[PDB]
């Protein structure tokens, strides 16, 4: 509620989404099994086999809540299509306010033609941020991001990973293929309004992780899907490259049912525990 945050929006469908901006209200959960009916798993897709290049603009008007959504290069966007704060985030959630035509600060409550947002994005460390996410006037999530990757593959099931999908291309990785929040095909980043833009990612458990990108510090409150009894055989573990948090004397904090990329504490390979999914042993 600052005088540098655009608030132009029409609840034209009378769905009452704007209320959650002011006072929290529970989201009707019975609609999710239909809303996420086309968020296919990473397992059922094609397999990349060749050189990997920064992909081209993928315009298919897909749904922006699934993890495998392929955003597009963007930039300046008129200030009359954004309601609520815009979260365009470096690996740690950060917020960019409204600016003037040429970047100078503006304090007009976003109710003016001159005010505009700038979202010229490039990968870190030398860039600024990976991707953006906001909700436009009438209440639909919108996203941006740097070009996804062209995994290739054979058949019409090409993937074009917007995130760090170790499977289907061992060389794909977040720092080189990331687009938006999804650190892996399972886990989001957590910011105050995450429950607003992404409606019912509300049962995700929260983990403490810290990551290194170009020799810089980062603390992330990743909020990552789960449920007990889910098969997590060794062929169901995605590379969430990161700096562990030293959870205990001889254990590390890892995203659920996954693994990080580091040599053991001493004379050891990666040693993952069979039942406690989110622990990787230092030395074993």
């Amino acid at each position: 509620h600052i005088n540098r945050t655009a608030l132009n929006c029409n609840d034209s469908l009378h769905t009452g989404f704007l209320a959650a901006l002011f006072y929290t209200h529970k989201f009707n959960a019975s609609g999710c099994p239909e809303r996420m009916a086309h968020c296919r798993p990473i397992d059922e897709f094609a397999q990349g086999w060749g050189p990997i290049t920064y992909a081209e603009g993928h315009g298919s008007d897909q749904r922006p809540y699934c993890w495998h959504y392929a955003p597009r290069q963007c930039g300046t966007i008129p200030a009359s299509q954004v309601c609520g704060p815009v979260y365009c985030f470096t690996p740690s959630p950060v917020v960019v306010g409204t600016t003037d035509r040429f970047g100078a600060p503006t304090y007009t409550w976003g109710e003016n033609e001159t005010d505009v947002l700038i979202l010229n994005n490039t990968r870190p460390p030398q860039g600024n941020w990976f991707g953006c996410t906001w909700m436009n006037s009438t209440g639909f999530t919108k996203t941006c991001g740097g070009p996804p990757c062209n995994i290739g593959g054979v058949g019409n099931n090409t993937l074009t990973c917007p995130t760090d999908c170790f499977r289907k291309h061992p060389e794909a990785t977040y720092t080189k293929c990331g687009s938006g929040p999804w650190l892996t095909p399972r886990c989001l980043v957590d910011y105050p309004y995450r429950l607003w833009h992404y409606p019912c990612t509300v049962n995700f458990t929260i983990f403490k992780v810290r990551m290194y990108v170009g020799g810089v510090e980062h603390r992330l409150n990743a909020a990552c899907n789960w449920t007990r009894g889910e098969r997590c055989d060794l062929q169901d573990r995605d590379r969430s490259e990161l700096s562990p948090l030293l959870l205990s004397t001889t254990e590390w904090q890892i995203l659920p049912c996954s693994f990080t990329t580091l040599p053991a504490l001493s004379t050891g390979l990666i040693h993952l525990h069979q039942n406690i999914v989110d622990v990787q042993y230092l030395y074993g």
Partner: antibody
Amino acid sequence: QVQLVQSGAEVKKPGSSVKVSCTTSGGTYINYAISWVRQAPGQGLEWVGGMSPISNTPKYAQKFQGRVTITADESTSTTYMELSSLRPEDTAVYYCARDLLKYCGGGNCHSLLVDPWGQGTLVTVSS
Amino acid sequence: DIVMTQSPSTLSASVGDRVTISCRASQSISSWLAWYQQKPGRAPKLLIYKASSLETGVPSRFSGSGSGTEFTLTISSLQPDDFATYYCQHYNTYLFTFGPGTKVDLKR
């Protein structure tokens, strides 16, 4: 698609108190702020009171302070309004409709009574 | 306080005519206003807000206007579904207010 359903028709005697409720159903969210209105027969409508969707602290018209209380529960998405000291002229049909924030801007954002409305419940305050 | 009044108390016209209704307040209100159409014996509906903007699903024929104290809900052409009473309403953060109500009927 949201449907609002009120209580049934009621009859009471002057001096008593009457309690009326209505529940929302089939909405993307769970709890909606509900605001009530009243019209004496053959007269223009009049706004009784309701739950503010900005702070949830119920607000009444200046001529119902104390006389009317507004309470609601989050379990069933139901809202309650009870009266006190019914005079004979309160006979009317009572409507409950959502107080939904539609327009927003200018350092503040204004709410409105939005379609649809409850079917209507009739109270006949006579002895 | 705020008192909203309408003039005239009743109006008359025929199908296809152009009619005008006036709602005026005691103290100047910038644009906070809205007109509800109340069919006799049924639940009222919203027509316009901000004194100029249409509501989704409302035929474009309805066209409000005005600002300050005086406002109006002028209809270019009447229709058989237009015969009702329009309660010019004011709103704000705390309270709401309604006017006595205008009626429009056939001319004979």
